[PDB]
């Protein structure tokens, strides 16, 4: 069993290298990990947190669910990280969401795609969660419409494809829920709206949460595999870090 | 693609699928001739079935499960050095 994953990892690394060369030659479609299941099988997402999560993080983890139609929540009490990924691959889960907080304030969010990656890590700022809204009500859990803004670079499409496949395919044209990821200087604003098509325009309505997402690490492997080759990394000590845009 | 198939296929491709050549790359046996001797003596199982034919070639779904038979004397020396020889599995 261990032999199979070891072999497939070598095949996966070879495939990305060949795909990278082909793209570079083209420089002179859907990404391979997702191409097999792109628009064939609906995604399965498992949402978890760090060990001994605070109450707010559990609430925030509950809210990241209602964003994604196919999300399931799992208490990470004493679960060991190789043990977590093996169980999730065993259950057929496609994506794993792990959340980090600091004094009940969400701080980081990492997304790992199974069975062989990729893994993308995000940092959380300006998180405004829905329990903080009084008399807000319940969400609508229909398949939402998706909007992606200002993803122009190759890394721009690359992050979109990761976030794109978290949702189900074939939303109804009159699907009343819309989720937008708006890139603004590498700070991806995430928001959820419900609307009404009016006779002289359209009116939307905020459901929440509000949280600005910035990628800082992207590796070719599962988030457990700390030996995974880094597809891309964020450089903060660069002198042009003051004014560099990637997405 | 078919266009590749007129050049990817080679005699070297078939031989690397040979069980003793599979045996070597896995580091299961030091040398191909050594692998042939073990195959003939019946100390190597591929999934549920034992192979005594060295010329047997392994397919891609199947190489993960090539190993020694449970009661191989070779499989005892394996776990004896590492001091993980469990009698209860009889190996």
């Amino acid at each position: 069993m261990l032999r199979r994953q070891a072999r497939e990892r070598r095949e996966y690394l070879y495939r990305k290298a060949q795909e990278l060369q082909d793209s570079q030659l083209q420089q002179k479609q859907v990404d391979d990990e997702y191409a097999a299941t792109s628009g064939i099988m609906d995604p399965r997402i498992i949402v978890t947190t760090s060990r001994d999560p605070s109450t707010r993080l559990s609430q925030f983890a509950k809210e990241i669910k209602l964003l994604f139609p196919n999300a399931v929540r799992l208490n990470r009490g004493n679960y060991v990280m190789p043990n977590l990924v093996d169980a999730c691959k065993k259950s057929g889960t496609t994506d794993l969401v792990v959340l980090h907080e600091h004094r009940g304030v969400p701080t980081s969010l990492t997304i790992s795609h199974f069975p062989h990656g990729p893994t993308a890590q995000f940092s959380l700022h300006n998180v405004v969660m829905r329990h903080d809204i009084i008399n807000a009500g319940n969400q609508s859990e229909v398949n939402p419409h998706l909007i992606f803004d200002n993803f122009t670079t190759a890394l721009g499409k690359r992050v979109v494809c990761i976030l794109k496949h978290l949702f189900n395919a074939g939303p109804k044209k009159d699907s009343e829920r819309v989720i937008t990821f708006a890139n603004r200087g590498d700070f991806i604003s995430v928001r959820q709206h419900v609307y009404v098509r009016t006779r002289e325009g359209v009116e939307i309505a905020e459901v929440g949460p509000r949280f600005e997402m910035r990628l800082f690490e992207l590796r070719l492997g599962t988030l457990e595999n700390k030996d995974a080759d880094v597809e891309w990394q964020l450089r903060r000590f660069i002198r042009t870090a003051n004014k560099k845009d990637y997405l | 693609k078919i266009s590749d198939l007129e050049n990817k296929v080679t005699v070297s491709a078939i031989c690397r699928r040979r069980l003793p050549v599979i045996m070597h790359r896995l580091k299961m046996a030091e040398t191909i001739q050594d692998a042939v001797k073990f195959i003939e003596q019946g100390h190597v199982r591929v999934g549920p079935n034992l192979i005594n034919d060295p010329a047997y070639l392994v397919t891609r779904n199947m190489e993960d499960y090539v190993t020694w038979v449970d009661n191989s004397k070779i499989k005892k020396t394996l776990l004896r050095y590492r001091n993980q020889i469990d009698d209860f599995d009889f190996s």
């Binding site: 030996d227 | 580091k27 299961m28 046996a29 030091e30 394996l78 004896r80 590492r82």
Partner: peptide
């Protein structure tokens, strides 16, 4: 070495293992 440690097939044979 850690990748090297991670993917150790537990079952590997050599002849020196007898001693």
């Amino acid at each position: 070495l850690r990748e090297k440690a991670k993917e150790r097939n537990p079952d590997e044979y050599y002849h020196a293992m007898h001693s």
